[PDB]
Design a protein around this ligand. Structure first.
Ligand code: WWO
Ligand code: ZN
Length: 257
């Protein structure tokens, strides 16, 4: 199956998923000197006050926290978006070393990790339909740099030992994703794709300019997760990022400066 290694990593995905070589693939390098300030973009509206987390899961590629999206409890709107996108899950990508791990880059800079908050367009009724549409998902991406701890991340870090291996889940209720956001909602946006197979070009990306700070100890705990299942040889879950893909004809817009 696909993964992150020499024999099944990003460079191989195109054989199963030919859209890997498509015209709107993600992630990309954000060239902050060619991005265009768009005074017509709106402010983001990030409304997570009623978010209901359910569970945390090691998928064998990353870990994710899932939400109850069967009512409008937590939604993203405004900015570049038409309509209302409902929060379904968040997850992270991270590196083996503090100098890599993000999927997007900024003027070629790599961050230690990247948080993705995945939302689906409510015009399509559910996530599975949405993922099949050109404007089905909106993913809010937030960079992580190593420095001071992020207190709102610690509940996530402390449950990771209970989901060490592929396919393990744990209850994860009452988690507030507002504690993962930076102060500023300034962002870049562009049209792209899922960053893992099936690589569908269904995503409006909204990448915040301001990183969050997490401690060295917080990210080290991410790196103690395993790609393998229990009872299989241990393979540390690190470097689960796709490198930047060609921008092609796209424009990245900035909400600021
Ligand atoms: N990076 S990304 O935001 O484009 C992304 C992932 F990297 C990713 F691994 C996933 S995945 O874990 O589902 C793997 C298949 O693409 C999703 N989709 C996230 C998702 C998972 C469960 C429920 C709803 C959304 C996905 F959206
Ligand atoms: Zn992701």
């Amino acid at each position: 199956h696909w993964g992150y290694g020499k024999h099944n990593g990003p460079e191989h995905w195109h054989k199963d998923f030919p859209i890997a070589k498509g015209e709107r693939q993600s992630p990309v390098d954000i060239d902050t000197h060619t991005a265009k300030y768009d005074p017509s973009l709106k402010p983001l509206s990030v409304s997570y006050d009623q978010a209901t987390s359910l569970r945390i899961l090691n998928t064998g590629y990353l870990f994710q926290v899932e939400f109850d999206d069967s009512q409008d409890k937590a939604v993203l709107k405004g900015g570049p978006l038409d309509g209302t996108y409902r929060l379904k899950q968040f997850h992270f990508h991270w590196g083996s070393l503090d100098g890599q791990g993000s999927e997007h880059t900024v003027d070629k800079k790599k961050y230690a990790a990247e948080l993705h908050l995945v939302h689906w367009n409510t015009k399509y009724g559910d996530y599975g339909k949405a993922v099949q549409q050109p404007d089905g998902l909106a993913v809010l991406g937030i960079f992580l740099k190593v420095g001071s701890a992020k207190p709102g991340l610690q509940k996530v870090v402390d449950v990771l030992d209970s989901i060490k291996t592929k396919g393990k889940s744990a209850d994860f209720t009452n988690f507030d994703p507002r504690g993962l956001l930076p102060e500023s909602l300034d962002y870049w946006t562009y049209p792209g794709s899922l960053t893992t197979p099936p690589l569908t070009e269904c995503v409006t990306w909204i990448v915040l300019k301001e990183p969050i700070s997490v401690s060295s100890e917080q990210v080290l705990k991410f790196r103690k997760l395993n790609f393998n299942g229990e009872g299989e040889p241990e393979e540390l879950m690190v470097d689960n990022w796709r490198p930047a893909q060609p921008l092609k004809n796209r424009q990245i817009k900035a909400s600021f400066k």
